[PDB]
Design an enzyme around this catalytic site. Structure first.
Site, PDB file in Angstrom:
ATOM      1  N   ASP B  89      -3.867 -26.063   3.116  1.00  0.00           N
ATOM      2  CA  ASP B  89      -5.261 -25.931   3.608  1.00  0.00           C
ATOM      3  C   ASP B  89      -5.696 -24.467   3.506  1.00  0.00           C
ATOM      4  O   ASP B  89      -6.072 -23.864   4.519  1.00  0.00           O
ATOM      5  CB  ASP B  89      -5.299 -26.474   5.031  1.00  0.00           C
ATOM      6  CG  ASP B  89      -6.668 -26.682   5.616  1.00  0.00           C
ATOM      7  OD1 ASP B  89      -7.629 -26.907   4.860  1.00  0.00           O
ATOM      8  OD2 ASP B  89      -6.735 -26.701   6.852  1.00  0.00           O
ATOM      9  N   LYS B  91      -8.202 -23.081   1.809  1.00  0.00           N
ATOM     10  CA  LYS B  91      -9.630 -22.787   1.829  1.00  0.00           C
ATOM     11  C   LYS B  91      -9.997 -21.606   0.918  1.00  0.00           C
ATOM     12  O   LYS B  91     -10.635 -20.631   1.318  1.00  0.00           O
ATOM     13  CB  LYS B  91     -10.134 -22.562   3.265  1.00  0.00           C
ATOM     14  CG  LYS B  91      -9.905 -23.774   4.178  1.00  0.00           C
ATOM     15  CD  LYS B  91     -10.747 -23.661   5.452  1.00  0.00           C
ATOM     16  CE  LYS B  91     -10.672 -24.962   6.240  1.00  0.00           C
ATOM     17  NZ  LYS B  91     -11.528 -24.894   7.415  1.00  0.00           N
ATOM     18  N   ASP B  94     -13.115 -17.244  -2.863  1.00  0.00           N
ATOM     19  CA  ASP B  94     -13.337 -15.956  -3.544  1.00  0.00           C
ATOM     20  C   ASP B  94     -13.851 -16.253  -4.945  1.00  0.00           C
ATOM     21  O   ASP B  94     -14.041 -17.420  -5.321  1.00  0.00           O
ATOM     22  CB  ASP B  94     -12.057 -15.120  -3.510  1.00  0.00           C
ATOM     23  CG  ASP B  94     -12.278 -13.622  -3.442  1.00  0.00           C
ATOM     24  OD1 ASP B  94     -13.181 -13.118  -4.166  1.00  0.00           O
ATOM     25  OD2 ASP B  94     -11.540 -12.952  -2.677  1.00  0.00           O
TER      26      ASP B  94
HETATM   27  O1  LIG Z   1      -9.574 -27.971   6.067  1.00  0.00           O
HETATM   28  C1  LIG Z   1      -9.273 -28.424   7.216  1.00  0.00           C
HETATM   29  O2  LIG Z   1      -8.322 -29.188   7.398  1.00  0.00           O
HETATM   30  C2  LIG Z   1     -10.178 -28.118   8.363  1.00  0.00           C
HETATM   31  C3  LIG Z   1     -11.552 -28.140   8.147  1.00  0.00           C
HETATM   32  C4  LIG Z   1     -12.409 -28.240   9.238  1.00  0.00           C
HETATM   33  O3  LIG Z   1     -13.643 -28.446   9.094  1.00  0.00           O
HETATM   34  N1  LIG Z   1     -11.903 -28.295  10.495  1.00  0.00           N
HETATM   35  C5  LIG Z   1     -10.601 -28.209  10.752  1.00  0.00           C
HETATM   36  O4  LIG Z   1     -10.201 -28.282  11.931  1.00  0.00           O
HETATM   37  N2  LIG Z   1      -9.689 -28.021   9.700  1.00  0.00           N
HETATM   38  C6  LIG Z   1      -8.241 -27.776   9.946  1.00  0.00           C
HETATM   39  O5  LIG Z   1      -7.669 -28.978  10.486  1.00  0.00           O
HETATM   40  C7  LIG Z   1      -6.831 -28.650  11.597  1.00  0.00           C
HETATM   41  C8  LIG Z   1      -7.448 -29.169  12.904  1.00  0.00           C
HETATM   42  O6  LIG Z   1      -6.412 -29.092  13.867  1.00  0.00           O
HETATM   43  P1  LIG Z   1      -6.610 -29.679  15.351  1.00  0.00           P
HETATM   44  O7  LIG Z   1      -7.938 -29.208  15.924  1.00  0.00           O
HETATM   45  O8  LIG Z   1      -5.417 -29.113  16.084  1.00  0.00           O
HETATM   46  O9  LIG Z   1      -6.524 -31.188  15.254  1.00  0.00           O
HETATM   47  C9  LIG Z   1      -6.673 -27.132  11.589  1.00  0.00           C
HETATM   48  O10 LIG Z   1      -5.482 -26.759  10.879  1.00  0.00           O
HETATM   49  C10 LIG Z   1      -7.903 -26.618  10.891  1.00  0.00           C
HETATM   50  O11 LIG Z   1      -7.577 -25.425  10.188  1.00  0.00           O
HETATM   51  O1  LIG Z   2     -15.034  -9.595  -0.631  1.00  0.00           O
HETATM   52  C1  LIG Z   2     -15.075  -9.067  -1.787  1.00  0.00           C
HETATM   53  O2  LIG Z   2     -14.685  -7.917  -2.003  1.00  0.00           O
HETATM   54  C2  LIG Z   2     -15.732  -9.822  -2.893  1.00  0.00           C
HETATM   55  C3  LIG Z   2     -16.896 -10.530  -2.611  1.00  0.00           C
HETATM   56  C4  LIG Z   2     -17.727 -10.916  -3.659  1.00  0.00           C
HETATM   57  O3  LIG Z   2     -18.873 -11.394  -3.453  1.00  0.00           O
HETATM   58  N1  LIG Z   2     -17.388 -10.617  -4.938  1.00  0.00           N
HETATM   59  C5  LIG Z   2     -16.253 -10.002  -5.258  1.00  0.00           C
HETATM   60  O4  LIG Z   2     -16.009  -9.744  -6.453  1.00  0.00           O
HETATM   61  N2  LIG Z   2     -15.332  -9.663  -4.253  1.00  0.00           N
HETATM   62  C6  LIG Z   2     -13.988  -9.106  -4.572  1.00  0.00           C
HETATM   63  O5  LIG Z   2     -14.168  -7.790  -5.122  1.00  0.00           O
HETATM   64  C7  LIG Z   2     -13.338  -7.638  -6.276  1.00  0.00           C
HETATM   65  C8  LIG Z   2     -14.198  -7.545  -7.545  1.00  0.00           C
HETATM   66  O6  LIG Z   2     -13.327  -7.073  -8.557  1.00  0.00           O
HETATM   67  P1  LIG Z   2     -13.876  -6.701 -10.022  1.00  0.00           P
HETATM   68  O7  LIG Z   2     -14.777  -7.813 -10.537  1.00  0.00           O
HETATM   69  O8  LIG Z   2     -12.602  -6.557 -10.818  1.00  0.00           O
HETATM   70  O9  LIG Z   2     -14.601  -5.375  -9.908  1.00  0.00           O
HETATM   71  C9  LIG Z   2     -12.397  -8.840  -6.296  1.00  0.00           C
HETATM   72  O10 LIG Z   2     -11.158  -8.514  -5.650  1.00  0.00           O
HETATM   73  C10 LIG Z   2     -13.132  -9.920  -5.547  1.00  0.00           C
HETATM   74  O11 LIG Z   2     -12.189 -10.747  -4.877  1.00  0.00           O
END
Ligand SMILES: O=C(O)c1cc(=O)[nH]c(=O)n1[C@@H]1O[C@H](COP(=O)(O)O)[C@@H](O)[C@H]1O
Ligand SMILES: O=C(O)c1cc(=O)[nH]c(=O)n1[C@@H]1O[C@H](COP(=O)(O)O)[C@@H](O)[C@H]1O
Lengths: 256, 256
Positions: B89, B91, B94
């Site tokens: 999970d 998520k 980037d």
């Molecule tokens: O991607 C997920 O599973 C996630 C999405 C979301 O909208 N809400 C959500 O609770 N989760 C994940 O699902 C789990 C929920 O856990 P409990 O609240 O303990 O049942 C956690 O590990 C969250 O990180």
């Molecule tokens: O949070 C960030 O830095 C990020 C946000 C975003 O909108 N766009 C973005 O490019 N970044 C990060 O900034 C860096 C951009 O790298 P370059 O495209 O190589 O200059 C990467 O490490 C991305 O993960």
């Protein structure tokens, strides 16, 4: 418009923002290096050589093949020596209860070494609440992702306004934004802008570039985040100096 | 409406979705355990004891204090033995160029052991493109986060519609969604719903709960994701059986 040095003294300034703004003015740098490398030795050699040129080193700890907490110890030594902040670009984006563990624990212990982290606002303000329960006691700061550089970004209009409101309602912990532009009218908040190169273009996976003059000078952001524009160059020190001088002059010309 | 077993045979079904749907029907389970623990020994003891009761074990590899790739080797042995998928999970949220490295590399090598991962759609379709360049060759699948369980979620209206379009335009790799409800009318796509407990309530950091009957029966989702409702219970096996029977009967009653 206040200088970085004057913004460092604003009554509502966060201590992490103040430290950053002070060293930006002292060193004449508003460049954040995106140290997008997989080897600890390359990360540390870049941090040491480019440290004087940067206000901040941005990490993706989860792409480092030989991560250990000792690598981050060596990075902190360089950050202290050369005076830059460490920003882990983790983009926390889960429920509050999950992100608090992802920030404090696991193998990376991000909160133990990262001055700054960032978060997406899409889960609602619980993401900030969860992070702040670890970060406030550890004297850390957070950036909220209000706009993104990538093609098809949904971080526009009401989404961006929600990010600004969330930041402003959590000013104890949130010190600014990842954005393409000035999104907050409050000068206590840093604007950091990725998607930056001197030349026009993009990558094959939705990255779009704008110049330092465009994002600092015309769009009113504070700091440029630069990865490949520096990292892929042969001479990464001279590349960093080119980006530093570009971002710094764009800032000065907006001040007048 | 088709049974899970019939959906497993749909012409456009992804192989990972087919494998999952087959074992859901074989085992009479549409329960995903959210194994939100910090100790490898607890993760593996839960996987072994609850394996027969679950279609899927969801991990947050980045909260495990003693992660090693060998822990994940032991988890795969249990997943094969008891017949469940592993869902990290993570998520991803980037730019495409960054998420491909976060998925394949670093310490976790997520793509080497995770059947499924998930991604936020807010960066645009480059997040999916980047993941799919690692995941397609490794025969993996991805879920897109179309709705979230947390208070203040911005994953509503046009955002949710964008997630569904992105999934449907990348069906080679995207096998379904994290959602609170059926969001796609195409039966080849899995709906997994977190924020589930038998009793009404929430947590102190924005989590909101609905029952298995509500989310499977009334909202038309396929799979419940349950963490604390099981993990915090004394007898985690009987808790898992209660959630399994609830989700399975809700599914059967919607089929008629
Ligand atoms: O991607 C997920 O599973 C996630 C999405 C979301 O909208 N809400 C959500 O609770 N989760 C994940 O699902 C789990 C929920 O856990 P409990 O609240 O303990 O049942 C956690 O590990 C969250 O990180
Ligand atoms: O949070 C960030 O830095 C990020 C946000 C975003 O909108 N766009 C973005 O490019 N970044 C990060 O900034 C860096 C951009 O790298 P370059 O495209 O190589 O200059 C990467 O490490 C991305 O993960």
């Amino acid at each position: 418009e206040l200088s970085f040095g004057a913004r460092a003294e604003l009554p509502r300034i966060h201590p992490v923002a103040s430290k950053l703004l002070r060293l930006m003015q002292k060193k004449e740098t508003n460049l954040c290096l995106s140290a997008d490398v997989s080897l600890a030795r390359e990360l540390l050699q870049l941090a040491d050589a480019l440290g004087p040129s940067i206000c901040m080193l941005k990490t993706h700890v989860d792409i480092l093949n030989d991560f250990t907490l000792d690598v981050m110890k060596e990075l902190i030594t360089l950050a202290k020596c050369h005076e830059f902040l460490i920003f882990e670009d983790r983009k926390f984006a889960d429920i509050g209860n999950t992100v608090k563990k992802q920030y404090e624990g696991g193998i990376f212990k991000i909160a133990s070494w990262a001055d700054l982290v960032n978060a997406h606002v899409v889960p609602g303000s619980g993401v900030v609440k969860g992070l702040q329960e670890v970060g406030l006691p550890l004297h850390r700061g957070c950036l909220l992702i209000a706009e993104m550089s990538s093609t098809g970004s949904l971080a526009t209009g009401d989404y961006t306004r929600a990010a600004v409101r969330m930041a402003e309602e959590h000013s104890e912990f949130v010190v600014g934004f990842i954005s393409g532009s000035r999104v907050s009218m409050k000068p206590e908040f840093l604007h950091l802008t990725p998607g930056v190169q001197l030349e026009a273009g993009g990558d094959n996976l939705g990255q779009q570039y704008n110049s330092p003059q465009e994002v600092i000078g015309k769009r009113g952001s504070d700091i440029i985040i630069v990865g490949r524009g520096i990292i892929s160059a042969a001479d990464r020190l001279e590349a960093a100096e080119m980006y530093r001088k570009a971002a710094w002059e764009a800032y000065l010309s907006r001040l007048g």
